[PDB]
Amino acid sequence: PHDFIFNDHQLSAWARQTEQVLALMTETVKGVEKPFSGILPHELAREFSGVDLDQGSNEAALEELKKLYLRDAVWFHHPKYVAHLNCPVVLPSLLAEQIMAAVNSSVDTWDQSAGGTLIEQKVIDWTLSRIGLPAGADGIFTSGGTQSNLMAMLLARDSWCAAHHPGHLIKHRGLPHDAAKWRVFTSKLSHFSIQKSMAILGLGYDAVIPVDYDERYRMDVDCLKQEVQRCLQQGLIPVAVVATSGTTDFGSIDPLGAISELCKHHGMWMHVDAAYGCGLLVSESHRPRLAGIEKADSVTVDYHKSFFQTVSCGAFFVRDKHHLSHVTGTPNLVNKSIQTTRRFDALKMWLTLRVSGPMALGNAFDDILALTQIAHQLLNAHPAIEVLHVPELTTQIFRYVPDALTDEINTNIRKAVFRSGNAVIAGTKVNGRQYLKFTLLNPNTTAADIEDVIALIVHYGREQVRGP
Amino acid sequence: HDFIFNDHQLSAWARQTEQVLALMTETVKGVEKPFSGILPHELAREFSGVDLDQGSNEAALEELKKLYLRDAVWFHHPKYVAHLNCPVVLPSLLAEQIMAAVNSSVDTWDQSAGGTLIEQKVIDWTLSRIGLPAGADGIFTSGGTQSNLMAMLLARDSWCAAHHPGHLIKHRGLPHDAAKWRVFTSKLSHFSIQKSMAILGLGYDAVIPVDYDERYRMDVDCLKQEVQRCLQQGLIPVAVVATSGTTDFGSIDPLGAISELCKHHGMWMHVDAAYGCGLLVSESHRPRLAGIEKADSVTVDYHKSFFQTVSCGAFFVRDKHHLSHVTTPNLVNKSIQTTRRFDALKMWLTLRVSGPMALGNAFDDILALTQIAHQLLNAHPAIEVLHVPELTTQIFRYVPLTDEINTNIRKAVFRSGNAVIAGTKVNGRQYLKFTLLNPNTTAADIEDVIALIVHYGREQVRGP
Numbered sequence: 005p006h007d008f009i010f011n012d013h014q015l016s017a018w019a020r021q022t023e024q025v026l027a028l029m030t031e032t033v034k035g036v037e038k039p040f041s042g043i044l045p046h047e048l049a050r051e052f053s054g055v056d057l058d059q060g061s062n063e064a065a066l067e068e069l070k071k072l073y074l075r076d077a078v079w080f081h082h083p084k085y086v087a088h089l090n091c092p093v094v095l096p097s098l099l100a101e102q103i104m105a106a107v108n109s110s111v112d113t114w115d116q117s118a119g120g121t122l123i124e125q126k127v128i129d130w131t132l133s134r135i136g137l138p139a140g141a142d143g144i145f146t147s148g149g150t151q152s153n154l155m156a157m158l159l160a161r162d163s164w165c166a167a168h169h170p171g172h173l174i175k176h177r178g179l180p181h182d183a184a185k186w187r188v189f190t191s192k193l194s195h196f197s198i199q200k201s202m203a204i205l206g207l208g209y210d211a212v213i214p215v216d217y218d219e220r221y222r223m224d225v226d227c228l229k230q231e232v233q234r235c236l237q238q239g240l241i242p243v244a245v246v247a248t249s250g251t252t253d254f255g256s257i258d259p260l261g262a263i264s265e266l267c268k269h270h271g272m273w274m275h276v277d278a279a280y281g282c283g284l285l286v287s288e289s290h291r292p293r294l295a296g297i298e299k300a301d302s303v304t305v306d307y308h309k310s311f312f313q314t315v316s317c318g319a320f321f322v323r324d325k326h327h328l329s330h331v332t333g334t335p336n337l338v339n340k341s342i343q344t345t346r347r348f349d350a351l352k353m354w355l356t357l358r359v360s361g362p363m364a365l366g367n368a369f370d371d372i373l374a375l376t377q378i379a380h381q382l383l384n385a386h387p388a389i390e391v392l393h394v395p396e397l398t399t400q401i402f403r404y405v406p407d408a409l410t411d412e413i414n415t416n417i418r419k420a421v422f423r424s425g426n427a428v429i430a431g432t433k434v435n436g437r438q439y440l441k442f443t444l445l446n447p448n449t450t451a452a453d454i455e456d457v458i459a460l461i462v463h464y465g466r467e468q469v470r471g472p
Numbered sequence: 473h474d475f476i477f478n479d480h481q482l483s484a485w486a487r488q489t490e491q492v493l494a495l496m497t498e499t500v501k502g503v504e505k506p507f508s509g510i511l512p513h514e515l516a517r518e519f520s521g522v523d524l525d526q527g528s529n530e531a532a533l534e535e536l537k538k539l540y541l542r543d544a545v546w547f548h549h550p551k552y553v554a555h556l557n558c559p560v561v562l563p564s565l566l567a568e569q570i571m572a573a574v575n576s577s578v579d580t581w582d583q584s585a586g587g588t589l590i591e592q593k594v595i596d597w598t599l600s601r602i603g604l605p606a607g608a609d610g611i612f613t614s615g616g617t618q619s620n621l622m623a624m625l626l627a628r629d630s631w632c633a634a635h636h637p638g639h640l641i642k643h644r645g646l647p648h649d650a651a652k653w654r655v656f657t658s659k660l661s662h663f664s665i666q667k668s669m670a671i672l673g674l675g676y677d678a679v680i681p682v683d684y685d686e687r688y689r690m691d692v693d694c695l696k697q698e699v700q701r702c703l704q705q706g707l708i709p710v711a712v713v714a715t716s717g718t719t720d721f722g723s724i725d726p727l728g729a730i731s732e733l734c735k736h737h738g739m740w741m742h743v744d745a746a747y748g749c750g751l752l753v754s755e756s757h758r759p760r761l762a763g764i765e766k767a768d769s770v771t772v773d774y775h776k777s778f779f780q781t782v783s784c785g786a787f788f789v790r791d792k793h794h795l796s797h798v799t800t801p802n803l804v805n806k807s808i809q810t811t812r813r814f815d816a817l818k819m820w821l822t823l824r825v826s827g828p829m830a831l832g833n834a835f836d837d838i839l840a841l842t843q844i845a846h847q848l849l850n851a852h853p854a855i856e857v858l859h860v861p862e863l864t865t866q867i868f869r870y871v872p873l874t875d876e877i878n879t880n881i882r883k884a885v886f887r888s889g890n891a892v893i894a895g896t897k898v899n900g901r902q903y904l905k906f907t908l909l910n911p912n913t914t915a916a917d918i919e920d921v922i923a924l925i926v927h928y929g930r931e932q933v934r935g936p
């Protein structure tokens with residue numbers, strides 16, 4: 005009778021298994037004293053080596069899971085996880101995943117989702133209301149930021165080809181003769197998905213012209229102007245600009261308004277990469293810091309970085325829904341997607357808004373913005389810490405200065421902090437120099453928590469200088 | 473900040489988890505048919521009564537009853553017999569509950585730790601089942617579509633690196649001769665192939681459809697003749713996509729003989745096994761996938777034939793160095809995604825908890841049940857059947873304009889909600905479709921769905 009299948013017969017076996025994991029996760033989460041254990045990949049691989057997947061009930065697998073996974077997990081909920089763009093998650097997100105695991109709707113078509121199809125559209129339309137895109141706009145949920153950025157360069161590429169080579173559609177015929185000339189402009193601090201996407205699209209990293217940044221690490225529009233004009237004097241064709249409203253390392257917001265004027269003047273597609281920055285769409289006071297986003301031709305948004313939603317939760321938005329035609333009364337969302345089978349990720353944003361306010365999200369995001377201002381204060385205050393910027397969002401790039409030696413010393417500080425497990429820090433190269441990075445996404449993290457991690461950073465730094 | 477999942481909110485997590493278990497038990501118990509029949513414009517009339525700017529679980533879940541659960545398509549229900557939406561196994565739900573709490577992103581060791589290694593464990597195992605050689609590797613993806621984009625990306629980029637020494641498309645974009653490159657697939661191949669080639673900048677034109685057999689397997693003598701015709705136009709054969717389980721017919725292209733042709737031309741062989749991967753765990757049916765081991769890449773969907781929740785898919789290559797085009801155990805060096813969830817836990821827990829043998833037992837039953845559904849379809853004088861089931865699907869139509877009658881049967885059935893059936897188009901004619909992914913569908917269910925099909929059809933002709 006195939007006892008393993010979710011159905012009416014198995015509802016009691018489902019709820020008891022769910023009861024066991026709550027007991028196991030409750031004990032696990034209560035005994036988390038620190039964000040990581042320090043274990044090294046080779047140390048952990050030792051315990052994987054004699055496991056043989058061609059071979060115990062839930063209780064036995066979960067006992068083994070305890071050791072292989074939970075023991076050394078990176079705990080993003082812990083206040084001292086201040087590394088990459090991994091947010092703590094909110095309860096209505098887990099509420100949604102639990103339901104989603106039972107129904108397993110596929111939201112590519114109405115006939116595999118029903119109300120899931122309409123719910124996604126609601127979340128999308130609500131998002132578009134916050135961005136301020138005009139009437140005929142639309143969007144779609146994707147795997148995340150990377151696939152949204154692919155869809156953005158795909159549409160820029162294909163829409164340009166349709167307006168400049170009369171009914172020569174890339175979809176059918178591939179790339180026209182003059183594609184090798186097309187150029188996309190992005191900040192040197194843009195996410196690498198842009199370049200990866202142009203590889204995939206058959207134009208290569210060479211189609212991307214990196215544009216210098218400001219002294220506040222924002223893309224310099226004077227330098228963009230210069231790049232577009234140098235490009236026009238080589239016979240090359242400017243096609244698009246990627247503006248990043250929250251760079252991954254600096255949290256810096258490119259000047260949206262200025263970029264959008266340059267774009268229109270040269271007929272270019274404006275894509276706003278908001279994967280991190282989209283958190284400001286829910287801030288009572290900070291929302292104005294994204295002004296100029298309403299002008300974009302497309303927008304990428306990650307709810308799984310800045311809206312405390314589990315992975316995957318992210319979406320891609322267009323100003324004009326007709327451009328989505330390059331990717332394709334029954335509502336079938338597959339017509340706007342580059343995936344086929346797709347999970348009901350929108351339930352997460354749907355149940356979050358329904359249960360928790362939208363203002364509950366903004367309150368959190370605001371608290372993390374104010375906390376980062378405090379960390380910038382504490383970092384700058386320190387004579388041994390060199391800070392590069394005042395936080396435009398939730399991230400702070402800094403280093404310990406007691407060149408190729410200062411690089412060694414900071415890369416060893418991060419490795420030590422990691423091995424100690426007592427906090428998780430991230431790293432970045434800025435102009436070929438190793439910096440350390442703090443990204444703040446937990447609004448329960450306090451002043452005292454940041455103080456602790458700073459002391460750890462300077463302990464291990466002084467340890468590199470002084471040796472113990 | 474009360475709503476953040478952490479140590480202080482664990483009791484609230486547990487209380488809400490119990491709420492959903494109560495709500496879902498009630499709901500699934502009262503599911504008496506696979507769908508309600510509601511139209512989109514109908515359910516929409518309720519949805520606009522919701523303002524997303526305007527506050528607890530209990531109220532949210534009460535609302536969710538009418539807007540989502542009420543009219544959901546229930547794939548567990550034995551009279552769901554439409555597309556490839558499998559019931560789901562309990563260890564898959566086990567994995568999801570944990571995944572939600574921990575939320576690792578398995579693109580990097582520093583955002584998942586053991587998540588990274590567990591994934592590499594499930595990839596190695598699937599690899600052993602496929603039988604690719606030593607330096608093979610793979611990666612979880614969002615699904616078959618992305619997996620097939622990966623296939624065609626690698627066939628494209630590897631071809632160029634090998635023929636245009638030190639011209640990597642990664643950097644320079646498409647080389648001079650690329651508008652000549654051609655990929656060959658069956659006419660019953662999945663549309664993700666053409667879509668990938670559009671993305672890749674080569675276009676639907678770069679795909680050459682190949683005629684199929686009397687059993688809807690691609691015909692290697694027609695493949696030969698397409699390659700040879702392509703050569704004679706001076707275009708460049710680069711890849712073949714074999715489908716070890718076509719979406720519509722469940723037919724398996726002849727892997728053995730396609731591989732011999734590819735190797736003779738130095739083409740890339742992709743096996744799209746999104747559906748036909750289920751055979752990897754079957755005691756006795758595995759040999760029908762023989763030849764897969766000769767592939768340069770493979771697509772597998774755990775969310776189609778392994779009873780895993782969406783998303784659960786993977787991409788496999790014979791030679792790992794080809795994953796260099798897409799570029800501490802960091803799995804992102806082999807992906808075209810960045811942030812990516814721990815879908816591999818579903819497969820890990822399923823294998824740990826249930827037998828790999830308990831997956832094959834279920835798939836074997838569904839394959840048996842499809843042979844009976846074909847007998848019952850063939851027996852009916854009003855039903856025309858096209859094929860003996862190579863897998864789990866059966867394409868057929870009601871033959872008492874005939875295209876119009878069958879298209880209206882599928883719709884009438886969906887509107888009754890007593891069953892859910894699919895449909896498809898072969899040689900410009902409209903056919904209906906059964907696909908059987910539920911071990912608990914009985915003969916009597918299949919007999920019930922045919923009578924519904926015949927009743928609505930007779931209503932088209934007669935009018936009553």
Ligand SMILES: *Cc1c(COP(=O)(O)O)cnc(C)c1O
Pocket residue numbers: 343344345556614615616617618620662664715717718719744745746747773785
């Ligand atoms: C469904 C399917 C695909 C696409 O996979 P998704 O998981 O839906 O993206 C590819 N190939 C075949 C044979 C399929 O049946």
